């Protein structure tokens, strides 16, 4: 009914991300700082020593199985168009090591998908029952990179005392991304018990194993207008279900007030 922000990312992404609300009177959300890359608010000393990068010696486009960086995940999981292979393990994804500034290859090699940023047209929109959400404004084939879960890097100890625990993503002494105060478009992606994206851990400019970056890829073909969503997991719902239950509305819903009540009658 109304387009209310032309770009919630204020030009920081490759493409604009508009906000619309055809549901209610809620204004464009602005109780956070949009950032397009992870930020630090304490001393973390991410290992950025260029000599600690594993790297390839490819003189092609890194499409061969001989690429060292592909081999760090058994193989490169990207097809020629930048999409995950059909056989990609969507239940327990591997860790992806993209090419980096120590590799011999060019910036447009075939193993550089996440570091190249957002390409699909997305929209921040008002949902009926789950606050703000994110949807597709185009068709998105299976395996396509959507966006990264960007926020503030914090320790496990800090994450355990955060008063708002709606935007915490565990990396794996685990560290966490908190997207509450600093985040990007990902902080608006809702949980779906019938999900159409999956998170994957990825390494790009550094390989400090404490700090994988979290990339979302589509787990099936997505139609224009469909809400994007992933399975937050039981490390989320085990805590949160005491405070609210799932509104995704799926017949497969495992976290509704009904599903939970039906299980409690394991009796």
């Amino acid at each position: 009914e109304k387009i209310i922000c032309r770009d919630v990312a204020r030009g920081y992404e490759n493409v604009p991300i508009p906000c619309v609300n055809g549901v209610d009177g809620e204004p464009c959300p602005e109780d956070y700082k949009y950032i397009s890359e992870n930020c630090e608010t304490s001393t973390m000393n991410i290992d950025r020593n260029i000599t600690h990068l594993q790297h390839c010696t490819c003189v092609d486009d890194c499409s061969s199985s001989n690429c060292l960086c592909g081999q760090l995940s058994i193989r490169c999981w990207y097809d020629k168009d930048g999409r995950l292979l059909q056989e990609f393990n969507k239940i327990e994804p591997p860790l992806i090591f993209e090419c980096n500034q120590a590799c011999s290859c060019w910036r447009n090699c075939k193993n550089r998908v996440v570091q190249s940023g957002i390409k699909v047209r997305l929209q921040l929109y008002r949902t009926a029952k789950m606050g703000w959400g994110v949807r597709a404004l185009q068709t998105i084939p299976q395996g396509t990179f959507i966006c990264e879960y960007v926020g503030e890097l914090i320790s496990d100890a800090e994450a355990d005392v955060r008063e708002d625990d709606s935007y915490l993503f565990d990396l794996d002494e685990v560290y966490c991304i908190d997207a509450r105060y600093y985040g990007n478009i990902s902080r608006f992606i809702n949980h779906l018990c019938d999900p159409n994206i999956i998170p994957v851990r990825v390494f790009m400019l550094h390989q400090d194993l404490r700090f994988p970056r979290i990339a979302f890829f589509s787990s099936r073909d997505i139609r224009t207008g469909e809400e994007l969503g992933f399975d937050y997991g039981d490390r989320f719902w085990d805590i949160k279900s005491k405070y609210f239950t799932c509104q995704c509305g799926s017949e497969k819903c495992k976290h509704s007030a009904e599903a939970i009540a039906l299980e409690q009658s394991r009796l």
Partner: peptide, 9 residues
């Protein structure tokens, strides 16, 4: 388990 809710891979 932990005190706060965490999304996960």
């Amino acid at each position: 388990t932990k005190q706060t809710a965490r999304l996960s891979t």
